[PDB]
Structure 1
Amino acid sequence: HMCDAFVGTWKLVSSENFDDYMKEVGVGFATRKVAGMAKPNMIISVNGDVITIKSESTFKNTEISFILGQEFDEVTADDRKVKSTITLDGGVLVHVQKWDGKSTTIKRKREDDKLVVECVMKGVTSTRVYERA
């Protein structure tokens, strides 16, 4: 029952500062413009200890499966090859990605009927809000 409140099908309803977050990550102009239009559906499921997060959009379809605390390789939507570790910290899913000596952290939390995602790269934060689909 670890992540029960995350499980489901979620649709992006708002975004703030995502272009600036992507710039800070190192994403180039064309990917920023096209990726920034996307309205992904995020599908979260749990089977035993394995959590799966799928993201489906017009730009890319991705999928990650993982066990909490156990590092895995991820190819991101913007084509970074990263080493990821996802943990639960006080009810927040905390996802750290490492690549090329860099690091970014993505936090996912339940707030009211929403799933709120905070993406941080150095001093730049983007907030992405999802509703049930």
Structure 2
Amino acid sequence: MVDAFLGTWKLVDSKNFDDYMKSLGVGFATRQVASMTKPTTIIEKNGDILTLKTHSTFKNTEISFKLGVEFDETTADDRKVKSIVTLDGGKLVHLQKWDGQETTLVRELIDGKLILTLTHGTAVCTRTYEKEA
């Protein structure tokens, strides 16, 4: 179900990430470093448990979850959120909730590339990842 998402992915295009970070209240200095960072995202599976690592020269994160089961998460920008990840239309949809706010992180495969769409408020960011061998 999730199997074409699995592997190591490198950031190759970003659009509107500053908009997205600013909407979340990320400070200018962090937005500045993040705008020049190219993370590696690693998505692994062990049975029903997915682990999603995001590695960079600035911030690292790691989450583990079962699809369709809520989990606590502390994001790269230090939000403490209630999260759930599911497959929807073949897309991996990650919803974060905190303080009555929501953001979605939607991953879809298009021509072998991993497109991550990040929405908060009115801000919509599109970031493109290519697989590493």
Provide the rounded CA distance (Å) in 2 between the counterparts of 1:67 and 1:21. 26
Provide the rounded CA distance (Å) in 1 between the counterparts of 2:70 and 2:37. 28
Residue of structure 1 equivalent to 2:102 = 103
Q: Which segments of 5 or more consecutive residues in structure 2 lack a partner in the other structure?
A: none
Write out aligned runs for 1:16-55 (5 A): 16-55=15-54
Offset, 1:64: 0.6
Write out aligned runs for 1:56-67 (5 A): 56-67=55-66
**TM-score, structure 1 normalization:** 0.96
Offset, 1:8: 0.6
Provide the rounded CA distance (Å) in 2 between the counterparts of 1:82 and 1:8. 25
Offset, 1:19: 0.2
Tell me the amino acid that sits aligned with residue 28 of structure 1. Answer: G
Q: Which segments of 5 or more consecutive residues in structure 1 lack a partner in the other structure?
A: none
Look up the SS of the partner of 1:85 in the other structure: strand
Provide the rounded CA distance (Å) in 2 between the counterparts of 1:24 and 1:61. 21
Provide the rounded CA distance (Å) in 1 between the counterparts of 2:4 and 2:71. 23
What number of residue pairs does the alignment pair up?
A: 132
Provide the rounded CA distance (Å) in 2 between the counterparts of 1:26 and 1:69. 28
Tell me the amino acid that sits aligned with residue 39 of structure 1. Answer: K
Cα deviation digits, residues 76-127 of structure 1 (max 9, x gap): 1111111111111011011111112211001001111100000001221000
Look up the SS of the partner of 1:45 in the other structure: strand
Residue of structure 2 equivalent to 1:3 = 2
Residue of structure 2 equivalent to 1:68 = 67
**TM-score, structure 2 normalization:** 0.96
State the identity %: 64
Provide the rounded CA distance (Å) in 1 between the counterparts of 2:18 and 2:119. 12
Look up the SS of the partner of 1:23 in the other structure: helix
Offset, 1:128: 0.3
Root mean square deviation, CA, Å: 0.9
